[model samples]
Target: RSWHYVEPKFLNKAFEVALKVQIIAGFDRGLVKWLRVHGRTLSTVQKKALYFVNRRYMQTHWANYMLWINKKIDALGRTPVVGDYTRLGAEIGRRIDMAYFYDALKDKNMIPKYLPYMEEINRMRPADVPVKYM
Candidate 1:
């Protein structure tokens, strides 16, 4: 029946909303700072490569976060809601910020000027968010 489509549609909608928030609220700021620091030195191809790597890293984490959230929602026996996605969107953003800026960028010695931002992100991240594949 058509009714079976409703839950999948709503889940898809919620996933999109969460992904949007993750990119806009979480990914953009770190990306801008990354560019500012390495824009002049790195060639265009290098920049493109880094962008893809970072995208893959962030997307992986985002996907896992959504899976975790979905499990939680299912356990609670509740319909998907906007508040659920929005709240976790911020958390995932913080997680990506720390992973990309601090751990990854530091490995490349690219975060000297941006260390303060990384520290702030580390401090802001919630204690409960497990260190996943990142």
Candidate 2:
């Protein structure tokens, strides 16, 4: 029962999550592992198909990863804690701080420009995939 496992809506939402993930990580090799772990029991065929279906969305903002990273970096300024610092605060604060860590690489100029994409994506809070492992 493939439909029982993953309905089209769920698959679409998962692809959306994967797109956000690539937006954050770029072409980093570590992303592959995270994709598999988050993808749960998806087979190689499923994974490949997911790639094909969402690859364009991933590429749509592919070159702007750093810009989003900076947006998060600036957003971190709104919160008080650094992500790796003492973990003693409200949950949302930590999530804010964590974004700054991505720009620790300091490749600011690579994608200094900004886009409205993050606001739109962040607003989609629940990506709607029902997998327990996600």
Instruction: Give candidate 2 regions above 4 Å deviation.
Output: 1-30, 62-134
Candidate 2 on 1-134: residue-level lDDT in tens? 01122222213343445444433443334336546565687654544443332333333333243244324534455332343222222221222221232244244534322334433433444344222310
lDDT of 1 by residue, 1-134 (tens): 01111133224543554545455557667777777876789764555455444545664665566456655665567675566667767877775453444466668875333344444443443332232332
Q: List the residue pairs that clash in candidate 2.
A: none
Q: Model 1: residues >4 Å from true position, as ranges?
A: 1-10, 14-18, 63-68, 97-134
Q: What TM-score does structure 2 among the candidates reach?
A: 0.23
Best by TM-score: 1
**Cα lDDT computed for each candidate against the true fold:** 0.53, 0.36
Task: Please give the lDDT score for candidate 1.
Answer: 0.53
